[PDB]
């Protein structure tokens, strides 16, 4: 048998967030992702009460945000380990759960307050201005220009969900895979390239 077993799909391991990020919870955030790698702190827990020790390994991820569920959806990029003189660096498909639910829970922050306040006041000035220009015997232009400018500047901001670097989460290996050292990977490659016809 090889050094490492077959990690079954749905196996989960407790971990600690080492690098956080602001998730960019915008409609276009799924393509604009940020790295939020973490570190494995417990034994991989697998089906039928069987567990493997992959502790101290680093797992690199990328995350975006969601404002409806108010959570950071995180996609696992890779896992790396340095065990003995054995180097592991493998791309894995998985995700992150926080308190038993998909994604990590955080608040939604918007830094648009000042510009939004300015736009509001600019057109409040506009409405008073119109109700002063309304005066017939039997400020509006500047307010409108400033309102347009400030609304344009405020729509640049998008909400973000900040995730710290001290939270405990769970990494889930959604698809089953085989752990492999870089040496094992090269052995598989060179043999494949040999084409023993």
């Amino acid at each position: 048998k090889p050094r490492f077993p077959w990690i079954s799909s749905g196996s989960f391991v407790e971990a600690i967030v080492v690098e956080g990020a602001d998730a960019n919870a915008s409609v276009t955030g799924d393509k604009n992702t940020a790295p939020m790698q973490l570190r494995l702190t417990g034994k991989v827990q697998m089906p039928n009460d069987e567990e493997f020790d992959l502790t101290g390994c680093f797992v690199t991820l990328e995350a975006w945000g969601d404002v409806s569920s108010e959570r950071a959806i995180v996609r696992s990029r890779s896992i790396s380990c340095k065990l003995g003189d054995d180097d592991i660096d493998q791309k894995i498909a998985g995700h992150v759960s926080f308190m038993g639910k998909n994604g990590i829970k955080g608040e939604v922050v918007m830094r648009n307050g000042q510009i939004l306040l300015y736009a509001g006041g600019a057109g409040f000035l506009d409405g008073i201005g119109k109700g002063i220009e309304k005066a017939s015997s039997t400020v509006s232009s500047a307010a409108k220009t400033l309102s347009d400018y400030y609304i344009k500047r405020a729509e640049q901001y998008h909400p973000v969900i900040p995730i710290g670097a001290g939270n405990e989460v769970t990494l889930v290996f959604q698809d089953g895979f085989q752990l492999e050292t870089l040496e094992e990977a090269r052995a598989k490659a060179a043999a494949r390239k040999k084409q023993n016809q």
Partner: protein, 37 residues
């Protein structure tokens, strides 16, 4: 309002203590040790 339930039931969130990356690595190292005691 929104017309549906406004809040969740977990009432739980993460934190942000300005923890450095090295501090987080050390904290994770110490956690695992206690768990594998």
């Amino acid at each position: 309002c929104a017309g549906v339930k406004s809040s969740f039931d977990c009432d739980a969130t993460t934190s942000d203590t300005c923890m450095t990356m090295t501090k987080a690595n050390q904290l994770a190292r110490d956690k695992a040790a206690k768990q594998a005691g």
